[PDB]
């Protein structure tokens, strides 16, 4: 009567950074997705290619849970075929993606007076990220023609910029915990069906 560890993913004390997003493989277990929908504490529960209600019957071979914290504004960017700073350089969702994006406000969890430095979204990248590709590099960004040489300088900028998370910040700038569930339907064991 194996049960999928959704509680570990959803109720983790600290979520990972959006640039350094955490991917957890879920397999060989029964998952009650409907229980998550019934709680309804999530501001965003958008499912693409599948219906959020009644998806128990469908059987999924490979389920991946991706966890990161972003601003309220960026939640729209976490969708297929969306363009944004977060989409281009931090987390990319494929155009043909089938799965559910779950986001809830975590203002009371991920905020500190004077700002929290942990989240650190990527601000500069040479090229747009490929879908489901993670970059953790801290190499200096050569905006200028002159080489940085590995040191901060005029026209050379650190790639990662820290989100300033404050309790007083507006809902758009407030932290949001986002879990993206990726479902694969193929000819395979389909162990994590979750009826």
């Amino acid at each position, epitope marked *: 009567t194996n049960l999928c560890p959704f509680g570990e993913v959803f109720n983790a*004390t*600290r979520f990972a950074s959006v640039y350094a997003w955490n991917r957890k493989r879920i397999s060989n277990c029964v998952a009650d997705y409907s229980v998550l929908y019934n709680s309804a504490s999530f501001s965003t529960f958008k499912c693409y290619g599948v219906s959020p209600t009644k998806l128990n019957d469908l059987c999924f071979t490979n389920v991946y849970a991706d966890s990161f914290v972003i601003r309220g504004d960026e939640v729209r960017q976490i969708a297929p075929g969306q363009t944004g700073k977060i989409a281009d350089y931090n987390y990319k969702l494929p155009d043909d993606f089938t799965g559910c994006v779950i986001a809830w406000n975590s*203002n*009371n*969890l991920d*905020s*500190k*007076v*004077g*700002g*929290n*430095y*942990n989240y650190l979204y990527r601000l500069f990248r040479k090229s747009n990220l490929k879908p489901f590709e993670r970059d953790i590099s801290t190499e200096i960004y050569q905006a200028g023609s002159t080489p940085c040489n590995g040191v901060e300088g005029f026209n050379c900028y650190f790639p990662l910029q820290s989100y300033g998370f404050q*309790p*007083t910040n507006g809902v758009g700038y407030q932290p949001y915990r986002v879990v993206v569930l990726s479902f694969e339907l193929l000819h395979a064991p389909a162990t994590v069906c979750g009826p």
Partner: antibody
Amino acid sequence: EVQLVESGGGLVQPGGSLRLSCTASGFTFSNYGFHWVRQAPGKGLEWVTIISYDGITKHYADSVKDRFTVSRDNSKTMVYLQMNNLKLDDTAVYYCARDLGTYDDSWGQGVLVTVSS
Amino acid sequence: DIQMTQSPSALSASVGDRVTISCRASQNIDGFLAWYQQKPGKAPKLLIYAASRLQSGIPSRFSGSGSGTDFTLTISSLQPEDFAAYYCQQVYSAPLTFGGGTKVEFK
């Protein structure tokens, strides 16, 4: 293991100046903001000041505002609570904390500061 | 400024009893409340954060509830170790303010 140790607490005269240095170890000092809390003898807790991770932002409670200055050195991993115009009321055990009331919360043992004439 | 009122300060109970400690914020602080337990001559230990989230390494008996201006701390079963001062501190505002203090005492 995150460790905070308070030093520099000692006997002082009223109107004297004392500085308390909060040594930190086991974590990245720059990433986390720091707080100072004082418990007066036979009294409840009283938050004193905050210094942000960047260090530009500093906030002080009125009872110590314009008399206490909070500073930090990232290289030395020490937070300094400069105290000036000390008073008999100021006498307390001063605790240095990291990110109060959050998952990153940590507390030092505390150092007793005594103001006596 | 935000002001925290912690009642009942003089609460007493025997071992195994259910204890409740109520903290009231003067103005809305969302879920930004923390609960601390201070034993005599010891640094405060953070039992609860974010109003209801238990800190790691804290016993499960401690629990928190409430949002907005009203909050509560509940101990399901009292223990000898639990007989200590309890404090509620808001973290929403830039100047943090602690509560008065509640001393759970053996009956």
